[PDB]
Design an enzyme around this catalytic site. Structure first.
Site, short mmCIF file in Angstrom:
data_model
loop_
_atom_site.label_atom_id
_atom_site.label_comp_id
_atom_site.label_asym_id
_atom_site.label_seq_id
_atom_site.Cartn_x
_atom_site.Cartn_y
_atom_site.Cartn_z
N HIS A 152 7.27 64.88 66.71
CA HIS A 152 7.36 63.44 66.46
C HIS A 152 7.85 63.17 65.05
O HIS A 152 8.71 62.31 64.84
CB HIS A 152 6.00 62.78 66.68
N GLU A 171 11.68 61.61 64.28
CA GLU A 171 11.87 60.37 63.54
C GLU A 171 12.77 60.59 62.33
O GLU A 171 13.66 59.78 62.06
CB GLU A 171 10.52 59.81 63.09
N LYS A 185 16.43 61.08 63.45
CA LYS A 185 17.08 59.83 63.85
C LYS A 185 17.56 59.06 62.63
O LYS A 185 18.69 58.55 62.62
CB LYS A 185 16.12 58.99 64.69
N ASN A 186 16.73 58.96 61.60
CA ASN A 186 17.15 58.26 60.38
C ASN A 186 18.30 58.99 59.70
O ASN A 186 19.27 58.36 59.27
CB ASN A 186 15.97 58.12 59.43
#
Ligand code: 6I4
Ligand code: 6I4
Ligand code: CL
Ligand code: CL
Lengths: 340, 340
Positions: free
Chosen positions: A227, A231, A234-235
C-alpha cells in the site's frame, strides 16, 4: 442502552501492543485459536472503547455531524457484538466459529470509514473554514483514529485468516522487499499506461550492508508495504509523466533497498520536477488534501504502525525522494498505538 | 542601574525583520550611513532587550549559573553602549564613527558566547541530568538565542563592513553557489587529508530548471552558506573515510544544486554507512551533542534565518543526504527572528 457504560469501563484499560514475535506465536498453529479468542474478546473492546471515548470528546460542531454520528454508530454496534462473547465458553467450538464470523461482519461494517471521514473533512472546510488550528486538530485526531483502525484490522485479519478451519496470516516471515516493490510498480505502471499512454521504467538497487550478496528479506506485513509503495509509485509516475509531456526522454523511477543493523530503508526517487518546500507539508495534511485522497498520510501511518516512518524530501526543479523507514529486526517491530 | 528598566521598555517592541532588498538599500551607498545609524540605535536595543527578557525568564537553576550570568552581563553592557547614541546628533560625523567603533567592540565582546553556552549545557547535564523535557527546553531556548545572535551580528556586520570610510557588505548579489560549495569542500578536504591521509572527491551537478545552460546565482550571504556547507562536508568526509578504512574504493561526495521557481536547494550525498533513524534527531540536539560541537544545529539556524531550512535523511548501511533549502528570490528572503 449500556454503550456509554461499556465505553467508560473499557476506556480505563490501556491497549496492549503486540510484537511480531507475539503475532507469530498467536498464528503458529490452530491450537492457539482459544488463546486468540480469549485475548481478542478483551483487547478489541479496549481498543474500540479508547478511540470511541476520544470521539465523544470532539467538539459538538464535529461530533453532531452526520459523518461522525454514522461512524460512531458503527463502532457502538461492533463493540456490542464483541460483548456477547465475554461470557461464552472458549472450549465450545461453536463459540469460536461464531466469534470469527462476528469479526468478519465487524470488518465489513467499517469498510467505508475512510471516504466517510473524508466527507466530514470537506464538510468542515465548507462549514467552518480551513484555518491552521483546525488543520492541526483534524490531523491530530485522524492520525490517531486511522492508526487505531489499522491496529484493530490487523488483529481481526490475523484471527480470521489463520483460524479458518510459510505465511502467518497477513505476516510474511520471509518477505522479499524487492518483490513487493516490483508488484506495486507493476500495478502503478498498468494504471499509468491506461491514463497517460507512457510510463517510467523501474530501477531497483539493493544494499545489504552485512551480507552484500544476499537478497534482503524481513518479517513484515506485505499488504501494508504494498500500500505504501503503490501510493508512492502513483505520485512519482504522475509527476514524471506530466513534467515530461513536451519531452521525449522519460526518466526512470529509482528504488534503493538498504538493510542496516536496525533499519530497513526504502528510497523512491523520481525526476518529476519537484515540489517547493512550502508545499511539502500539505501533501500529508488531511484537510489540505481534501477537495470537492488520503493515500500519503495513511501510508505514513502504515509505516509508523510497526515503529517506522515515511518521509518526503524534494528538490524543486528536479525531483522528489521518499523514504520508507522500517525496523529491520522482528524484536524491534512492535505495534505503535495511539497514546490515550 | 537602569538595565532592568531598559530591558522592560525595549522588550515591549517587536523586532523589525528586514528583507534582502532592504539590506541592499541600506548598503547601496555611503549616503545611507545616517539612516543605518538611526535605524540601528533603535532596532539593536529592541532585539537585545527581547532576548534578554527571555533569558531573565529562565528557571533560577539555569539563570543563576556562571555561564548565563556571564553572557547576560555581556548583553547588559552592549545594551548600555548602544543607549549612549540615542540622544546624539546623526549629522555629526564623529557620532557616526564612534557608533561604528562601539558596534565592533560589542561584536568582539560576544565572540565566545557559543562555547560559553556549550559549557552551560554540559554543566546542566551533569548537575540535573539529560531528560527529554530538559533537552526540549534547552533546544527551544538555544535555537531562539542563537537565531537572535545571528540576526544581531548580521545587522552589525552590514553597518561596519559598508560604512568603513559588487558585494554589499556580507551580501553577494551574484553569489555563485557552486563556487561556495567548492570553497567549503576544499577547506574540509585540507583538514581531512591532515587527519586521515585520504579524502573523497567532489562531484557537483547543477539543475537550472528555467535556464538549463545558465550557472546558478542568487542573492545571499556567502559566509553563511560556507558555514553550512563546511559543516556538512566535514561530517560527510569523516563518515566516508572512517566507514571505508578496510576498503580501497573511497566514494565521492556528490552535491546537486537545483534552482526552482521559489527554492534553491543544495543536496549533499555521501556513502558513509548511514545513521539509523532513531539517532538522526540527536545530531541536531544541543544537549545530546554536548560531551565532556553545535555545527549542525547552528547550521540549520543559518538556513532558517532567511526563510530556509536544513534537513537530513539517512539510509543505514549505505549513506546520508543533507539538503539546504534556500529561497531563490530576494523578495522571499526575509529575516526570520524569534517570535516574542
Ligand atoms: C511534482 C510532485 C508532486 C508530488 C509528488 C511528487 N512530485 N513526487 C512524489 C513522490 C515521489 C516518490 C518520491 C511521493 C509522494 C508525492 C510526490
Ligand atoms: C555515519 C554518519 C554520521 C553522521 C553524518 C553522516 N554519516 N553523514 C552526515 C552528513 C552528510 C552530508 C550528508 C551531514 C551531517 C551529519 C552526517
Ligand atoms: Cl473504522
Ligand atoms: Cl551573543
Amino acid at each position: 442502552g449500556s454503550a456509554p457504560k461499556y465505553i467508560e469501563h473499557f476506556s480505563k484499560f490501556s491497549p496492549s501492543p503486540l510484537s511480531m514475535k507475539q503475532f507469530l506465536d498467536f498464528g503458529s498453529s490452530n491450537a492457539c485459536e482459544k488463546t486468540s479468542f480469549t485475548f481478542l474478546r478483551q483487547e478489541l473492546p479496549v481498543r474500540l472503547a479508547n478511540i470511541m471515548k476520544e470521539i465523544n470528546l470532539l467538539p459538538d460542531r464535529v461530533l453532531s455531524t452526520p459523518s461522525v454520528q454514522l461512524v460512531q454508530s458503527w463502532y457502538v454496534q461492533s463493540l456490542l457484538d464483541i460483548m456477547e462473547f465475554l461470557d461464552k465458553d472458549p472450549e465450545d467450538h461453536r463459540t469460536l466459529s461464531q466469534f470469527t464470523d462476528a469479526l468478519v461482519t465487524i470488518r465489513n461494517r467499517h469498510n467505508d470509514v475512510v471516504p466517510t471521514m473524508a466527507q466530514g473533512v470537506l464538510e468542515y472546510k465548507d462549514t467552518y473554514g480551513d484555518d491552521p488550528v483546525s488543520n492541526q486538530n483534524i490531523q491530530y485526531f485522524l492520525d490517531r483514529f486511522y492508526l487505531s483502525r489499522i491496529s484493530i484490522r490487523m488483529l481481526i485479519n490475523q484471527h480470521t485468516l489463520i483460524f479458518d478451519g510459510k505465511h502467518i496470516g497477513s505476516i510474511d516471515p520471509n518477505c522479499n522487499v524487492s518483490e513487493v516493490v516490483k508488484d506495486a510498480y507493476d500495478m502503478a505502471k498498468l494504471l499509468c499506461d491506461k491514463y497517460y499512454m507512457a510510463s517510467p521504467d523501474l530501477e531497483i538497487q539493493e544494499i545489504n550492508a552485512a551480507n552484500s550478496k544476499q537478497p534482503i528479506h524481513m518479517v513484515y506485513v506485505p499488504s501494508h508495504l504494498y500500500h505504501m509503495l503503490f501510493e508512492l509509485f502513483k505520485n512519482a509516475m504522475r509527476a514524471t509523466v506530466e513534467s515530461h509531456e513536451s519531452s521525449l526522454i522519460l526518466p526512470p523511477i529509482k528504488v534503493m533497498v538498504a538493510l542496516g543493523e536496525e533499519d530497513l530503508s526504502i528510497k523512491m526517487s523520481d525526476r518529476g520536477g519537484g515540489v517547493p518546500l512550502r508545499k511539502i507539508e500539505r501533501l500529508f495534511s488531511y484537510m489540505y488534501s481534501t477537495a470537492p485522497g488520503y493515500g500519503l498520510p495513511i501510508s505514513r501511518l502504515y509505516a509508523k504502525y510497526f515503529q517506522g516512518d515515511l518521509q518526503l524530501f524534494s528538490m524543486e526543479g528536479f525531483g522528489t525522494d521518499a523514504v520508507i523507514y522500517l525496523k529491520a529486526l522482528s524484536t524491534d517491530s512492535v505495534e505503535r498505538l495511539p497514546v490515550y
